[PDB]
Write a protein that binds this ligand. Structure first.
Ligand SMILES: Cc1cc2nc3c(=O)[nH]c(=O)nc-3n(C[C@H](O)[C@H](O)[C@H](O)COP(=O)(O)O)c2cc1C
Length: 168
């Protein structure tokens, strides 16, 4: 339909978060694509995109998003609105917190994607992040390992913001 959510997952947390994002948006709005089963051309099917990706192995892309990283050069994101979220561990990995979505966004916005859905760094404890854009996160940062009780409200709040930014 209108929003395509393309998520990568290893232990399933970003997946869970994606399911709640669909629930929050109201039913048919967001479709949930596991990028492990995706082709890079699937991104052509939407004008509004949500990109979901955890950071693994000290500052790296989740390996299914890594599998599509190079091929992002084969897609034109011009004219699309794009939002980002990920799961992360701010305590264990304070120098590389939410690096992944920062890596995806830098590439996608270079190919024409307009970023929406910036998120406040308030209430997170970390040192450095590739997701940082003029004092904000490039997208929604969830931490299921340390802040699981904050997740549901952070998504509900983020979804209401995206409706406004997507012009739904
Ligand atoms: C070996 C390992 C490395 C990790 N590296 C990072 C990291 O670099 N940055 C970060 O924010 N989180 C890191 N984490 C935390 C994961 O991103 C976190 O557990 C996330 O919720 C997993 O998402 P997923 O289940 O969708 O794969 C790491 C976790 C493991 C165990």
């Amino acid at each position: 339909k209108k929003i395509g959510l393309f998520y990568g997952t290893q232990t399933g947390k970003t997946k869970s978060v994606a399911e709640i994002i669909r629930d929050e948006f109201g039913n048919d709005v967001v479709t949930l694509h596991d990028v492990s089963q995706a082709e890079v051309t699937d991104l052509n099917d939407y004008q509004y995109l949500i990109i979901g990706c955890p950071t693994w192995n000290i500052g790296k892309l989740q390996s299914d998003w890594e599998g599509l990283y190079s091929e992002l050069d084969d897609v034109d994101f011009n004219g699309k609105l794009v939002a980002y979220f990920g799961t992360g561990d701010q305590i264990g990995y304070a120098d590389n917190f939410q690096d992944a979505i920062g890596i995806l966004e830098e590439k996608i916005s270079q190919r024409g994607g307009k970023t929406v859905g910036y998120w406040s760094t308030d209430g997170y404890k970390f040192n450095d992040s590739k997701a940082l854009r003029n004092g904000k996160f490039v997208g929604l940062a969830l931490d299921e390992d340390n802040q699981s009780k904050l997740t549901d409200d952070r998504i509900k709040s983020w979804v209401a913001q995206l409706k406004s930014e997507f012009g739904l």
